[PDB]
Amino acid sequence: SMQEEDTFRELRIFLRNVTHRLAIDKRFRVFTKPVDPDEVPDYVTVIKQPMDLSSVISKIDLHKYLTVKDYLRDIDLICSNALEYNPDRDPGDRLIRHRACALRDTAYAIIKEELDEDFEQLCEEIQESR
Numbered sequence: 285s286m287q288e289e290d291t292f293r294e295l296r297i298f299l300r301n302v303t304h305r306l307a308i309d310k311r312f313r314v315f316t317k318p319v320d321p322d323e324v325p326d327y328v329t330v331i332k333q334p335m336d337l338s339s340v341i342s343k344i345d346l347h348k349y350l351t352v353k354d355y356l357r358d359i360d361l362i363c364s365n366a367l368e369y370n371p372d373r374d375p376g377d378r379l380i381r382h383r384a385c386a387l388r389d390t391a392y393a394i395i396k397e398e399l400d401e402d403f404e405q406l407c408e409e410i411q412e413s414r
């Protein structure tokens with residue numbers, strides 16, 4: 285319905301805003317663009333589902349997220365990819381992991397404080413009906 289399309293439009297606006305706030309955070313610079321195979325050569329073959337904040341924006345705009353839960357699955361993927369690709373004790377690896385965990389925690393904390401749970405419930409019920 286038209287009221288349902290208004291719901292999903294509000295969801296997209298909310299998701300773009302959260303994503304923009306993560307993207308402008310200096311700690312999350314390495315998550316703002318897809319990992320480049322020329323700069324990180326052993327990546328594209330080891331990480332099956334690459335995910336980053338620009339690809340998240342593209343997915344919002346293509347109407348791929350119908351709930352915050354779907355959006356959070358991709359935020360989780362940015363974090364899980366960094367943990368998987370950088371598992372070593374070395375500082376470089378530990379720094380990416382801390383930044384990935386911090387990006388995930390920040391997205392969840394923003395949504396916990398600003399997302400009305402009845403708004404999410406409505407999105408989930410429209411999604412389940414389709």
Ligand SMILES: Cc1nnc2c(NC3CCN(C)CC3)cc(C(=O)N3[C@H]4Cc5ccccc5[C@@H]3CNC4=O)nn12
Nearest residue numbers: 313314315316317318319320323324366369376377380
């Ligand atoms: C994500 C993600 N997951 N793991 C990594 C990582 N790992 C390092 C850990 C330490 N060892 C020794 C080398 C591999 C490095 C970068 C990274 O420094 N990037 C990425 C993504 C990106 C995006 C926007 C702006 C800057 C960057 C920089 C430069 N080019 C890249 O492709 N990202 N990354």
